[PDB]
């Protein structure tokens, strides 16, 4: 209901060597969540970053089904071969040290993939009064984002997650 | 044990209109967490500050015991002489737009007064699995943070409270 875990058995260390070298040739944007955009809409002129424009000015999360094919080849791409769901508008969702979210809720449940992070990293379910860490142990996190939540790093580096948004 | 709430009957505007103009004569310091000590140590030479120092250089949080002069005949001082409990080491915490803490223990619990807050700032229980929001309410708001916790604000503007430090 209000999460999940879902065996991957994704090898972290390699998830963050491939997660690294992909953002030396594509950037983050923004600064205080930073984001790259790991799938486009078809025939999207700029791939990489249309998916991470405020939802007020996206189509619907359900047109953002292309992986980049630069993915496919890599240890990403193994990722996406290994869902047990199709995903839409998956991003790479970057915290910053010390940032955290508004509290807010989304239109649709999102999946969590943590590639780098700490104790100082937690999900809050707000009106559920629940704490979670999600761990860059290879496996997939569900959260029902449309539930009133925010999320946090205390931490003193960047915290990495994979988010892979959902239909069904 | 974990929180309770104190009948104070303090005003909200007043409080904010007081706090606001002494902000205007003794500014904050750092930039995350914004600070400004209300009490110092006997004879101390930067009464404003020094309480605001990291903890391994903290003497011990009860030398900070001198309520500053300058507040007396203003509404904070009318604030402090209805404490229910002795005040040591009392600071305006200021937390920047989307800034959070690590998550910690402190040596004692505190207590918190909000002076201005939004629904996007929460206190986070981590091991009690507790989400508490310190409502600017005029009231007194004890929280154990011996207990492993952290604070953020998903704000837009800046969350103020004064946090007063305690012994028995
Ligand atoms: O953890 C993240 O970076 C995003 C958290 C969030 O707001 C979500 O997944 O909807
Ligand atoms: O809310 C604050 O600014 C301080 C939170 C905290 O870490 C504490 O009260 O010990
Ligand atoms: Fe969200
Ligand atoms: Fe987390
Ligand atoms: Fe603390
Ligand atoms: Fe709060
Ligand atoms: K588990
Ligand atoms: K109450």
Redesign the pocket.
């Known amino acids: 209901a209000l999460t999940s875990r879902t065996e991957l058995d994704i090898d972290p260390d390699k998830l963050r060597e491939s997660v690294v070298e992909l953002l030396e040739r594509h950037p983050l944007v923004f600064e205080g969540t930073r984001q790259l955009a790991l799938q486009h809409r078809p025939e999207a002129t700029d791939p990489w970053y249309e998916g991470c424009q405020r939802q007020s000015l996206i189509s619907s999360d359900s047109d953002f089904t292309e992986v980049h094919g630069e993915l496919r080849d890599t240890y990403l791409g193994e990722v996406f071969d290994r869902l047990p769901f199709k995903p839409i508008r998956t991003r790479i969702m970057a915290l910053d040290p010390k940032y955290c979210?508004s509290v807010?809720?989304?239109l649709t449940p999102?999946y969590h993939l943590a590639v780098t992070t700490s104790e100082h990293a937690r999900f809050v379910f707000i009106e559920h009064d629940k704490v979670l860490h999600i761990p860059a142990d290879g496996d997939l996190y569900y959260?029902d984002?449309r539930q009133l939540?925010?999320?946090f790093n205390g931490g003193d580096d960047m915290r990495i997650h994979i988010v892979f948004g959902t239909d069904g």
């Open positions: 979210y807010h809720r989304d999102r959260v984002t939540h925010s999320a």
